[PDB]
């Protein structure tokens, strides 16, 4: 997985992600965009697989966007059997619940940071106002790290793949550095959904495991776009 949240020079927030999954020639046929309806209105939009009730990707229009990336320190399944049985939430169920209920980017960040989880994860959240982008590195009990955008100091994008951002990416699976270089070469002044989509189309950010690419912007919810790959 790769998730990117970024701010252009005028303060607009953009959010994109690739969902990678091994042995996924089948999941491509089961990928679907879902509009979740409340009171005859589109409450939030996500992308999922048929039969999967949580969301790894979605937007609350005019409020925030969310994507999750898998985080593995080993023994996931073992630790998730242990973690389930105490009222903790599945990763993608929390995303869906947050899209449904949270009133603001601020509120979503707190919920995604603090709600106990059955597994570790990275949550990437974008809002509608300047600086409203964050990578939340989650332990099961709470946040290991909160990493917001800081354009004031020249840090106008955050890239997350599947590794802790304060550690180097492993040389055998370094999709982070090519994404950073591609964003660097795009420039803050040329960031938009189209150029973000292109960054997410670069090998190995886009690779043989990539099921779909989504780009989205809470401030422009009608531009939500998922492209099934391969």
């Amino acid at each position: 997985c790769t998730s990117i949240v970024a701010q252009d020079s005028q303060g607009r927030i953009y959010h994109g992600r690739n969902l990678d999954y091994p042995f996924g020639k089948i999941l491509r046929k089961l990928t679907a965009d879902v509009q979740f309806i409340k009171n005859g209105q589109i409450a939030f939009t996500g992308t999922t697989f048929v039969g999967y009730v949580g969301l790894w990707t979605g937007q609350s229009p005019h409020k925030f966007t969310i994507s999750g990336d898998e985080r593995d320190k080993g023994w996931w399944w073992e630790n998730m059997i242990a973690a389930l049985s105490l009222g903790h939430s599945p990763i993608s169920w929390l995303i869906r619940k947050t899209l449904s209920e949270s009133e603001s980017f601020e509120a979503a960040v707190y919920t995604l940071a603090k709600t106990p989880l059955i597994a570790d994860v990275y949550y990437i959240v974008g809002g509608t106002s300047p600086k409203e982008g964050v990578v939340i590195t989650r332990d099961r009990g709470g946040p290991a790290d909160i990493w917001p955008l800081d354009p004031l100091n020249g840090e106008w994008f955050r890239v997350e793949t599947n590794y802790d951002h304060w550690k180097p990416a492993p040389k055998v699976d370094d999709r982070r550095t090519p994404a950073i270089k591609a964003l660097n070469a795009t420039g803050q002044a040329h960031l938009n959904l189209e150029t973000l989509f292109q960054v997410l189309s670069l090998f190995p950010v886009y690779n043989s495991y990539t099921i779909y690419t989504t780009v989205m912007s809470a401030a422009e919810p009608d531009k939500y776009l998922t492209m099934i790959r391969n």
Binding site: I26, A32, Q35, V53, W76, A119
Partner: protein, 95 residues
């Protein structure tokens, strides 16, 4: 348009055990069944399948009823065990 996934409406005002069925009606159950078996096959190590009954137990008691109610309606629609529905919905929490 081209290359985008199908678009579905899912109503949260419809009951949890009904709100996914319209979407499911667009897919061949045999196809979905084999897809579920695949994912469970190459994502759920066999030691996990051994205690899968345990996993069903905790979810029903410790996971929110819509989650479980939605999943059981999918399993009954596709002739899957509840265990398989929960497993495939927990198969993604990591690699």
């Amino acid at each position: 348009v081209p290359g985008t996934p199908p678009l579905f409406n899912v109503s949260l005002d419809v009951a949890p055990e009904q709100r996914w069925l319209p979407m499911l009606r667009h897919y061949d159950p045999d196809f979905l069944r084999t897809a579920v078996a695949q994912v469970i096959g190459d994502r759920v190590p066999q030691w996990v399948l051994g205690m899968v009954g345990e996993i069903v137990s905790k979810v029903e008691s410790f996971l929110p009823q819509p989650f479980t109610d939605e999943i059981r309606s999918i399993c009954d629609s596709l002739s899957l065990s509840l265990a398989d529905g929960i497993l495939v919905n927990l198969a993604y929490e990591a690699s």
